[PDB]
């Protein structure tokens, strides 16, 4: 069995072997990229997403979020304050300004070390779920508006016809913004770009332990626990490396840089931060191997969790029995 530890893998594709999306997924998969639940892969050289972002400032964050904690250093909930609009221009100085700057460090891990010291004790301000791309149409090799839908993939797969889109989405971080502990919809894939700007660390435990941490957030994290039966789909929890490690959660992290994709593996559970002002895009997508994924996914059900309009078809086809009590909650 390939990559038995479960250990993040870096790909580094030919020009050639990045032509066809499908087949190189299939390839990582082969090598064991997936037990990790989360692969790197390195463009080559010859290979970019746009010519600049010189003008990516007017876009707009029409409902910024402001990440307010609750709890202890090392295991604390989020909840999403929503702001004024500004733009991206507008964001990126607040991101760049004495309240919100990244702070003097010496590497990677010192600043990961202040993270997890301090980052309950601020309230930064993420644009994130931004319908948009910033991928240039002539782009043609990775392009994450230029994927094949997942609607399309269900149909191949079994036959089945649907209503939905699904698009790319942006993100517009700083300085500790945070995505918490969460596996995607409908465990889904996730691909994600780095455009732009100061790196993100990424945790992930394998797909095959995903188990262990929703055992270990459920005592965490005990009213809510009590409140949902799937209430990581809330995504708001947050967990550290030194309590994961104090309870023998297996996992790993690393860290994304510009230029570099991350792909996420159905039922990886994922979290991490950002290092200062960044811009990324990311999509949802799905493979054959995802079908027995999407069928067993635990779904919220107590209304907290966000659904788009996609996933009604998903779990309407592949999870009928649960589709009355789920669309009672959305
Ligand atoms: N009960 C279904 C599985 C499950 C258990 C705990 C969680 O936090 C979760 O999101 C899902
Ligand atoms: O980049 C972020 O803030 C969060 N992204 C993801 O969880 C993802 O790409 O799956
Ligand atoms: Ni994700
Ligand atoms: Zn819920």
Request: glycine share 8%; with cysteine.
């Amino acid at each position: 069995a390939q990559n038995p530890n479960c250990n993040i893998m870096i790909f580094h594709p030919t020009k050639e072997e990045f032509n066809d999306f499908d087949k190189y997924i299939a390839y990582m998969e082969s090598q064991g990229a997936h037990r990790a639940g989360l692969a790197k892969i390195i463009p080559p050289k010859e290979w970019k997403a746009r010519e600049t972002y010189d003008n990516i400032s007017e876009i707009l964050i029409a409902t910024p979020l402001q990440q307010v904690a609750s709890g202890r250093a090392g295991v604390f909930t989020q909840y999403h304050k929503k702001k004024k609009a500004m733009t991206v221009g507008e964001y990126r100085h607040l991101a760049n300004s004495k309240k919100y700057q990244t702070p003097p460090h010496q590497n990677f891990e010192d600043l990961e070390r202040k993270y997890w010291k301090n980052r309950i004790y601020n309230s930064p301000i993420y644009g994130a779920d931004i319908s948009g791309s910033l991928f240039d149409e002539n782009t043609k090799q990775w392009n994450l508006g230029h994927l094949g839908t997942i609607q399309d993939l269900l149909e191949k797969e079994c036959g089945v016809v649907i209503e939905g889109v699904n698009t790319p989405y942006l993100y517009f971080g700083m300085w500790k913004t945070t995505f918490a502990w969460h596996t995607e919809d409908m465990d889904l894939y996730s691909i994600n770009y780095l455009h732009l700007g100061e790196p993100k660390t990424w945790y992930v435990v394998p797909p095959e332990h995903g188990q262990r941490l929703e055992r270990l957030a459920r005592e965490l994290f005990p009213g809510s626990s009590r409140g949902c039966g799937a209430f990581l789909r809330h995504k708001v929890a947050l967990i550290s490396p030194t309590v994961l490690k104090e309870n023998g959660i297996p996992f790993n992290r690393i860290t994304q840089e510009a230029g570099e994709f991350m792909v996420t593996f159905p039922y990886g559970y994922h979290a991490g931060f950002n290092h200062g002002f960044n811009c990324a895009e990311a999509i949802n997508f799905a493979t054959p191997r995802w079908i027995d994924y999407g069928k067993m996914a635990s779904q919220c059900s107590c209304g907290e969790a966000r659904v788009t309009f996609s996933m009604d078809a998903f779990v309407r086809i592949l999870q009928p029995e649960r589709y009355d009590l789920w669309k009672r909650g959305q």
